[PDB]
Amino acid sequence: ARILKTAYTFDDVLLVPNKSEVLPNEVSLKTQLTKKIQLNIPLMSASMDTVTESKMAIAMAREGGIGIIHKNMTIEDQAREVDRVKRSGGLLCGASIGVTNDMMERVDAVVKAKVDVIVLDTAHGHSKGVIEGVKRIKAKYPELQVIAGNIATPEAVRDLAEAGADCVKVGIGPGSICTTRIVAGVGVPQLTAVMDCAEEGKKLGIPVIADGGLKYSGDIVKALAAGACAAMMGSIFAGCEEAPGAIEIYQGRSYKVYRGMGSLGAMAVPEGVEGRIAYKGHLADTIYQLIGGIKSGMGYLGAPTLENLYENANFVVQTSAGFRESHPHDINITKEAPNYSV
Template sequence: MENFTVFDYEDIQLIPNKCIVNSRSECDTTTRFGKHCFKLPVVPANMQTVIDESLAIKLAENGYFYIMHRFTPESRLPFVQMMNEKGLISSISVGVKENEYQFIVDLANHHLVPDYITIDIAHGHSNAVINMIKHIKKHLPDTFVIAGNVGTPEGVRELENAGADATKVGIGPGKVCITKLKTGFGTGGWQLAALRWCAKAARKPIIAEGGI
């Protein structure tokens, strides 16, 4: 990290260059992520207090990306089945405990292939996440795998090399997140610098963790 400049969103402003559009409505914010295009390059946090089944359906119906939380594990398989039946994208989260390995096998056995699976733990630069990436890719090779969270270029590269299709960058940068206070680790206060640092190493998409 020699000569590494630390900065965050509050430390920068955009340069007000010449505008060539007449209205904001002319601007196209569409982004391609995996096999699908979405209206905005923004996703709600996959927290139980933020996203639920009804909101996930509404977002998918209107062309927005979402990641369903993993805190009601028994509802995930029926959720994927329901979204597939509705013709909507299915995007879920998993952890790295032993029961999650069986869940992936259960999805494959039921021929349920989520469009997106996010491996969601606080410290994603770990053998546990690498092993889960490989497990998902073995049983559900067509699923787009998002892995995280990481805060260094080394973390991004290792997860990409393991088979991740995208990585989540940022540990505890949100204003109400207590990860940094509880553990002493994180990118809180230098999240934007971490994104710049990791983006230089990334060969695949990255998702910036933390609030806008």
């Protein structure tokens, strides 16, 4: 039983600027989610019953990303949801699958609805059940694109790619609503997890998704510079108008419900919590700020594409003092900024 190293999250690191011949308006955000699936922007919405149904997925895809329909619903309803996204323009769409008895039955129905990718998502992706589930899926549907998660190690990338996954999803414990690391003691701070896993995926030719723990646009730049093909978010999108759930008002402020899929409410021992986040308005305005920040970061790094970003990215580690310097400090902020908050 040994200590391997210090592992870092997004707030621990910064990207060093490079020489740049490209302006933020000239960079391309295109990325391959699998070898067969290109996104126009590297963003995905979490498959949670408070984040992504057909309305969110349609909106994500029109912006050039993708939404993964959650599976806290009957098989027929999830099929319906996928079908509505597919009929709204041949937009891309995903569907969540669990390691369950009816797993193949749920897969058959979202395939019938012509889902583009299934996400075999589970608390612990580096497990025999997930490995065998991927092998059953790829044996019946060899061309069906499969994302498997969640994981946090190069060995997990290796075993899941060996099983036939086309993409793997990284993140054990970083979610805003997640208590996995506290109740089970397990996880890897997300920037080191993505860096280590994406480096392994690149050697195998399998992309990785940086899933969870993202709070600012600059976090996504770091996830992409570390080598993730795409970034998945629940918190950043669950307050948008297109997220499921009504808008609630409490003492002058408008909120939407957001909860972990492993919380008591979502399941009705838990590994998530349930709560409220601020109402953000329409997805478009959030995406515009996220993409603007990504384009700026890429301008700072001289990267015209996502791959060039990864190839020339150098991180430095900052201390808690450096974190205090990186945020605004020693000012009473009195005007809303659209891409910042405390």
